[PDB]
């Protein structure tokens, strides 16, 4: 998209001092990581799954099961989510340029909240951070328990750590921004 | 072979009663049955045993674990093992006869019966070891169509898929079967010997 600039300099120029240090956290380190490096890491994930079986369809539900959301596409959803709640104030406060007060902390709530939520669902559906060379499936109709084997584990281990611990960042700065308002008024 | 009348006449010709009996179902019913029809049941047992897996070499491992001794070999070293004890007898008759003509049924005298009486009690003990190995190795007298396999290298369980379990099932039947009613015409015999001398 070639109008990245305006958008993103839109939010830059209504936000505060830690706003614009969230803003640059947000885009280079997870949009452009994402993009450029964890996209095609991905690409190969069904196509090189590799089962020790002769069962016709055991490949796809043992894929299914131990795989029921791309770690990417669950990455582009929380994106998504963690972004119109900073986009939306930032149209409110063009168009006033009081009230901001109540829209300004439900966003930064609002954010903590996604933030949390999707971190939740990584860890208790990929039960950790570790993606493992080897899994057992017994779904049907595959026979008895059959092995699998995961294409490239250990590089979607260290992308995942890394996206982690930036989602980590982003719950400690809005944390922040909520300490830094709350004195202001009630404190 | 071409001397077979040669040896199943002389046998024959050296037996009691029911030991002529004896000899039909021996040859008739399970030498027949295992050369005619049994050996060529189980000429595909490996060829077409298959394995539900693309694990190299667990087919072989798990043929191996579920059949360490065919059927039909089981059945032909148990054949050897209880016509010695016949043949054997039955040469020593020969000679026996032999020594009187040099001075047609059969009559235990002298020092026939220490041989015959145990000819016949090894046959039994013979038939009935083999009867029991069947038994314990194969748990039992039916073929099943899947086996269940866990051997290295096989990942986990395999399903595997034996070649004509049900045909192999009803020779097995028979085979057991005819067994039992030589084991009981056998002791018969010992039946008839124990009433004249000891009883």
Redesign the interface.
Known sequence: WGTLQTILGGVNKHSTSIGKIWLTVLFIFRIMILVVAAKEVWGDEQADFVC????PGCKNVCYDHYFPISHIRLWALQLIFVSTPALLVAMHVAYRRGSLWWTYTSSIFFRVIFEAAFMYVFYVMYDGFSMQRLV?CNAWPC?????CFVSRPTEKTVFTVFMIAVSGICILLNVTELCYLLIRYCS
């Open positions: 020790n079986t002769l069962q057992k026979p008895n328990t059959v092995d």
